[PDB]
mmCIF file of all heavy atoms in Angstrom:
data_model
loop_
_atom_site.group_PDB
_atom_site.id
_atom_site.type_symbol
_atom_site.label_atom_id
_atom_site.label_comp_id
_atom_site.label_asym_id
_atom_site.label_seq_id
_atom_site.Cartn_x
_atom_site.Cartn_y
_atom_site.Cartn_z
ATOM 1 N N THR A 1 109.955 93.312 86.137
ATOM 2 C CA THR A 1 109.644 92.431 85.028
ATOM 3 C C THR A 1 110.694 92.448 83.947
ATOM 4 O O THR A 1 111.353 93.459 83.733
ATOM 5 C CB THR A 1 108.266 92.815 84.429
ATOM 6 O OG1 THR A 1 107.816 91.791 83.536
ATOM 7 C CG2 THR A 1 108.335 94.123 83.553
ATOM 8 N N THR A 2 110.842 91.309 83.279
ATOM 9 C CA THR A 2 111.477 91.241 81.970
ATOM 10 C C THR A 2 110.571 90.509 80.983
ATOM 11 O O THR A 2 111.042 89.977 79.993
ATOM 12 C CB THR A 2 112.830 90.513 82.032
ATOM 13 O OG1 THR A 2 112.652 89.223 82.636
ATOM 14 C CG2 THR A 2 113.828 91.261 82.903
ATOM 15 N N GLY A 3 109.278 90.477 81.249
ATOM 16 C CA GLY A 3 108.356 89.776 80.369
ATOM 17 C C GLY A 3 107.104 89.289 81.064
ATOM 18 O O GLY A 3 106.042 89.304 80.456
ATOM 19 N N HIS A 4 107.240 88.824 82.305
ATOM 20 C CA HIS A 4 106.108 88.381 83.142
ATOM 21 C C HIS A 4 106.418 88.756 84.590
ATOM 22 O O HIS A 4 107.299 88.157 85.240
ATOM 23 C CB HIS A 4 105.877 86.869 83.020
ATOM 24 C CG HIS A 4 104.562 86.408 83.567
ATOM 25 N ND1 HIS A 4 104.406 85.197 84.206
ATOM 26 C CD2 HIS A 4 103.338 86.991 83.569
ATOM 27 C CE1 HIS A 4 103.148 85.057 84.589
ATOM 28 N NE2 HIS A 4 102.477 86.132 84.211
ATOM 29 N N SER A 5 105.694 89.750 85.087
ATOM 30 C CA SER A 5 106.075 90.461 86.310
ATOM 31 C C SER A 5 105.991 89.634 87.607
ATOM 32 O O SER A 5 105.164 88.740 87.729
ATOM 33 C CB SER A 5 105.230 91.724 86.448
ATOM 34 O OG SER A 5 103.945 91.364 86.855
ATOM 35 N N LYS A 6 106.895 89.934 88.544
ATOM 36 C CA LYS A 6 106.937 89.329 89.882
ATOM 37 C C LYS A 6 107.212 90.412 90.942
ATOM 38 O O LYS A 6 107.824 91.453 90.646
ATOM 39 C CB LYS A 6 108.066 88.298 89.966
ATOM 40 C CG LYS A 6 108.029 87.185 88.961
ATOM 41 C CD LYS A 6 106.909 86.203 89.272
ATOM 42 C CE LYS A 6 106.881 85.093 88.234
ATOM 43 N NZ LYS A 6 106.083 85.504 87.063
ATOM 44 N N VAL A 7 106.783 90.167 92.175
ATOM 45 C CA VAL A 7 107.094 91.072 93.281
ATOM 46 C C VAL A 7 108.481 90.744 93.845
ATOM 47 O O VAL A 7 108.708 89.647 94.347
ATOM 48 C CB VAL A 7 106.047 91.015 94.395
ATOM 49 C CG1 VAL A 7 106.410 91.990 95.528
ATOM 50 C CG2 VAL A 7 104.655 91.339 93.837
ATOM 51 N N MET A 8 109.410 91.680 93.721
ATOM 52 C CA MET A 8 110.752 91.526 94.267
ATOM 53 C C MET A 8 110.669 91.820 95.776
ATOM 54 O O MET A 8 110.185 92.885 96.173
ATOM 55 C CB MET A 8 111.711 92.543 93.659
ATOM 56 C CG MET A 8 111.933 92.456 92.166
ATOM 57 S SD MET A 8 112.795 90.800 91.624
ATOM 58 C CE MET A 8 111.309 89.878 91.202
ATOM 59 N N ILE A 9 111.135 90.884 96.599
ATOM 60 C CA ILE A 9 111.198 91.078 98.047
ATOM 61 C C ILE A 9 112.618 90.794 98.569
ATOM 62 O O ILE A 9 112.953 89.652 98.862
ATOM 63 C CB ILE A 9 110.195 90.177 98.776
ATOM 64 C CG1 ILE A 9 108.776 90.395 98.245
ATOM 65 C CG2 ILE A 9 110.210 90.490 100.281
ATOM 66 C CD1 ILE A 9 107.885 89.260 98.492
ATOM 67 N N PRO A 10 113.440 91.835 98.679
ATOM 68 C CA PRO A 10 114.847 91.673 99.047
ATOM 69 C C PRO A 10 115.041 91.462 100.545
ATOM 70 O O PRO A 10 114.729 92.341 101.337
ATOM 71 C CB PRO A 10 115.479 92.997 98.597
ATOM 72 C CG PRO A 10 114.384 93.992 98.770
ATOM 73 C CD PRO A 10 113.097 93.247 98.421
ATOM 74 N N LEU A 11 115.534 90.289 100.915
ATOM 75 C CA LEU A 11 115.729 89.925 102.316
ATOM 76 C C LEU A 11 117.186 90.103 102.697
ATOM 77 O O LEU A 11 118.085 89.972 101.851
ATOM 78 C CB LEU A 11 115.370 88.460 102.557
ATOM 79 C CG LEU A 11 113.970 88.019 102.135
ATOM 80 C CD1 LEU A 11 113.752 86.543 102.388
ATOM 81 C CD2 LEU A 11 112.948 88.846 102.856
ATOM 82 N N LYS A 12 117.419 90.383 103.976
ATOM 83 C CA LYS A 12 118.752 90.293 104.545
ATOM 84 C C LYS A 12 119.285 88.852 104.438
ATOM 85 O O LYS A 12 118.492 87.889 104.423
ATOM 86 C CB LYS A 12 118.723 90.743 106.005
ATOM 87 C CG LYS A 12 118.671 92.241 106.202
ATOM 88 C CD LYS A 12 118.545 92.582 107.690
ATOM 89 C CE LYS A 12 118.385 94.073 107.914
ATOM 90 N NZ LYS A 12 118.386 94.412 109.353
ATOM 91 N N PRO A 13 120.609 88.688 104.332
ATOM 92 C CA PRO A 13 121.206 87.358 104.222
ATOM 93 C C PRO A 13 120.986 86.531 105.481
ATOM 94 O O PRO A 13 121.043 85.318 105.434
ATOM 95 C CB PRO A 13 122.697 87.650 104.002
ATOM 96 C CG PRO A 13 122.911 89.013 104.540
ATOM 97 C CD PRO A 13 121.627 89.748 104.286
ATOM 98 N N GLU A 14 120.678 87.209 106.581
ATOM 99 C CA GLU A 14 120.390 86.563 107.850
ATOM 100 C C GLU A 14 119.064 85.798 107.903
ATOM 101 O O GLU A 14 118.883 84.953 108.776
ATOM 102 C CB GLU A 14 120.418 87.614 108.969
ATOM 103 C CG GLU A 14 121.817 88.030 109.367
ATOM 104 C CD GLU A 14 122.336 89.239 108.612
ATOM 105 O OE1 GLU A 14 121.616 89.799 107.752
ATOM 106 O OE2 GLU A 14 123.485 89.628 108.880
ATOM 107 N N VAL A 15 118.124 86.114 107.023
ATOM 108 C CA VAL A 15 116.820 85.467 107.062
ATOM 109 C C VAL A 15 116.962 84.012 106.605
ATOM 110 O O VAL A 15 117.697 83.715 105.652
ATOM 111 C CB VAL A 15 115.787 86.194 106.177
ATOM 112 C CG1 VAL A 15 114.434 85.489 106.227
ATOM 113 C CG2 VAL A 15 115.658 87.668 106.593
ATOM 114 N N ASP A 16 116.263 83.114 107.303
ATOM 115 C CA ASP A 16 116.242 81.698 106.963
ATOM 116 C C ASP A 16 115.186 81.477 105.889
ATOM 117 O O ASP A 16 114.015 81.180 106.169
ATOM 118 C CB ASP A 16 115.957 80.860 108.201
ATOM 119 C CG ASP A 16 116.105 79.366 107.949
ATOM 120 O OD1 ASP A 16 116.039 78.901 106.771
ATOM 121 O OD2 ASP A 16 116.278 78.586 108.900
ATOM 122 N N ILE A 17 115.602 81.644 104.644
ATOM 123 C CA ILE A 17 114.666 81.613 103.540
ATOM 124 C C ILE A 17 113.963 80.250 103.422
ATOM 125 O O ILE A 17 112.771 80.213 103.156
ATOM 126 C CB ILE A 17 115.339 82.076 102.223
ATOM 127 C CG1 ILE A 17 114.280 82.531 101.224
ATOM 128 C CG2 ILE A 17 116.213 80.963 101.616
ATOM 129 C CD1 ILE A 17 114.849 83.309 100.061
ATOM 130 N N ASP A 18 114.649 79.147 103.705
ATOM 131 C CA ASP A 18 114.002 77.816 103.671
ATOM 132 C C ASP A 18 112.917 77.621 104.714
ATOM 133 O O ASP A 18 112.073 76.767 104.546
ATOM 134 C CB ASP A 18 115.014 76.667 103.831
ATOM 135 C CG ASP A 18 115.983 76.568 102.668
ATOM 136 O OD1 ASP A 18 115.772 77.245 101.628
ATOM 137 O OD2 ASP A 18 117.003 75.832 102.719
ATOM 138 N N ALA A 19 112.922 78.408 105.781
ATOM 139 C CA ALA A 19 111.905 78.286 106.812
ATOM 140 C C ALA A 19 110.628 79.050 106.496
ATOM 141 O O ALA A 19 109.641 78.872 107.189
ATOM 142 C CB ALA A 19 112.467 78.727 108.175
ATOM 143 N N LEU A 20 110.626 79.882 105.456
ATOM 144 C CA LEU A 20 109.421 80.650 105.126
ATOM 145 C C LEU A 20 108.256 79.691 104.850
ATOM 146 O O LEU A 20 108.416 78.671 104.183
ATOM 147 C CB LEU A 20 109.632 81.576 103.917
ATOM 148 C CG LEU A 20 110.665 82.707 104.019
ATOM 149 C CD1 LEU A 20 110.740 83.467 102.691
ATOM 150 C CD2 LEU A 20 110.328 83.650 105.152
ATOM 151 N N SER A 21 107.099 80.010 105.419
ATOM 152 C CA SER A 21 105.870 79.281 105.151
ATOM 153 C C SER A 21 104.742 80.302 105.123
ATOM 154 O O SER A 21 104.088 80.540 106.138
ATOM 155 C CB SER A 21 105.630 78.204 106.230
ATOM 156 O OG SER A 21 104.493 77.438 105.879
ATOM 157 N N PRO A 22 104.555 80.953 103.974
ATOM 158 C CA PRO A 22 103.687 82.125 103.897
ATOM 159 C C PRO A 22 102.215 81.806 104.117
ATOM 160 O O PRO A 22 101.777 80.682 103.897
ATOM 161 C CB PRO A 22 103.908 82.637 102.458
ATOM 162 C CG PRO A 22 105.125 82.008 102.017
ATOM 163 C CD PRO A 22 105.158 80.659 102.671
ATOM 164 N N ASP A 23 101.476 82.804 104.582
ATOM 165 C CA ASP A 23 100.017 82.779 104.575
ATOM 166 C C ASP A 23 99.554 82.932 103.131
ATOM 167 O O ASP A 23 99.553 84.031 102.576
ATOM 168 C CB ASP A 23 99.488 83.910 105.436
ATOM 169 C CG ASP A 23 97.964 83.935 105.523
ATOM 170 O OD1 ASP A 23 97.268 83.358 104.651
ATOM 171 O OD2 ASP A 23 97.381 84.534 106.444
ATOM 172 N N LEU A 24 99.163 81.821 102.528
ATOM 173 C CA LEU A 24 98.926 81.765 101.099
ATOM 174 C C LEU A 24 97.622 82.468 100.724
ATOM 175 O O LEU A 24 97.528 83.078 99.672
ATOM 176 C CB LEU A 24 98.930 80.310 100.614
ATOM 177 C CG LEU A 24 100.187 79.484 100.897
ATOM 178 C CD1 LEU A 24 99.931 78.004 100.574
ATOM 179 C CD2 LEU A 24 101.368 80.001 100.126
ATOM 180 N N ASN A 25 96.626 82.400 101.597
ATOM 181 C CA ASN A 25 95.402 83.151 101.396
ATOM 182 C C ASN A 25 95.664 84.653 101.389
ATOM 183 O O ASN A 25 95.082 85.364 100.592
ATOM 184 C CB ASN A 25 94.380 82.802 102.475
ATOM 185 C CG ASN A 25 93.773 81.425 102.262
ATOM 186 O OD1 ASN A 25 93.790 80.893 101.149
ATOM 187 N ND2 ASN A 25 93.257 80.835 103.329
ATOM 188 N N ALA A 26 96.554 85.120 102.266
ATOM 189 C CA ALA A 26 96.924 86.527 102.295
ATOM 190 C C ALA A 26 97.645 86.941 101.012
ATOM 191 O O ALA A 26 97.348 87.988 100.472
ATOM 192 C CB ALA A 26 97.774 86.857 103.535
ATOM 193 N N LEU A 27 98.570 86.119 100.515
ATOM 194 C CA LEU A 27 99.264 86.416 99.254
ATOM 195 C C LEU A 27 98.285 86.451 98.067
ATOM 196 O O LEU A 27 98.387 87.315 97.197
ATOM 197 C CB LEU A 27 100.380 85.396 98.966
ATOM 198 C CG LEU A 27 101.620 85.382 99.865
ATOM 199 C CD1 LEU A 27 102.619 84.323 99.351
ATOM 200 C CD2 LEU A 27 102.259 86.749 99.966
ATOM 201 N N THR A 28 97.337 85.515 98.051
ATOM 202 C CA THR A 28 96.311 85.459 97.004
ATOM 203 C C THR A 28 95.483 86.752 96.983
ATOM 204 O O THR A 28 95.294 87.337 95.929
ATOM 205 C CB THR A 28 95.428 84.203 97.191
ATOM 206 O OG1 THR A 28 96.208 83.041 96.890
ATOM 207 C CG2 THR A 28 94.245 84.165 96.169
ATOM 208 N N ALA A 29 95.071 87.243 98.150
ATOM 209 C CA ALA A 29 94.332 88.497 98.230
ATOM 210 C C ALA A 29 95.195 89.709 97.842
ATOM 211 O O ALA A 29 94.704 90.647 97.209
ATOM 212 C CB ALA A 29 93.745 88.680 99.635
ATOM 213 N N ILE A 30 96.486 89.692 98.194
ATOM 214 C CA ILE A 30 97.377 90.782 97.796
ATOM 215 C C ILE A 30 97.526 90.817 96.275
ATOM 216 O O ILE A 30 97.474 91.877 95.677
ATOM 217 C CB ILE A 30 98.772 90.670 98.485
ATOM 218 C CG1 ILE A 30 98.637 90.907 99.985
ATOM 219 C CG2 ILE A 30 99.760 91.672 97.875
ATOM 220 C CD1 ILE A 30 99.801 90.341 100.813
#
C-alpha cells in the first residue's frame, strides 16, 4: 500500500497477462 491497499502478484515476463480471465467469484471470496 501507499494509501489504499492492493494484492501484489508478481508474474514472470513469459505469462500472457492479456489472456488472464480470473474466476471472479473466487477473488471476491478471497
Side-chain angles (χ1 to χ4, degrees):
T1 192
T2 54
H4 194 215
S5 75
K6 303 288 179 274
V7 181
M8 298 295 95
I9 305 158
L11 305 178
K12 282 176 184 185
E14 284 92 0
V15 180
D16 188 339
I17 201 166
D18 294 349
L20 297 178
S21 185
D23 182 339
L24 303 170
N25 286 338
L27 292 182
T28 290
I30 292 159

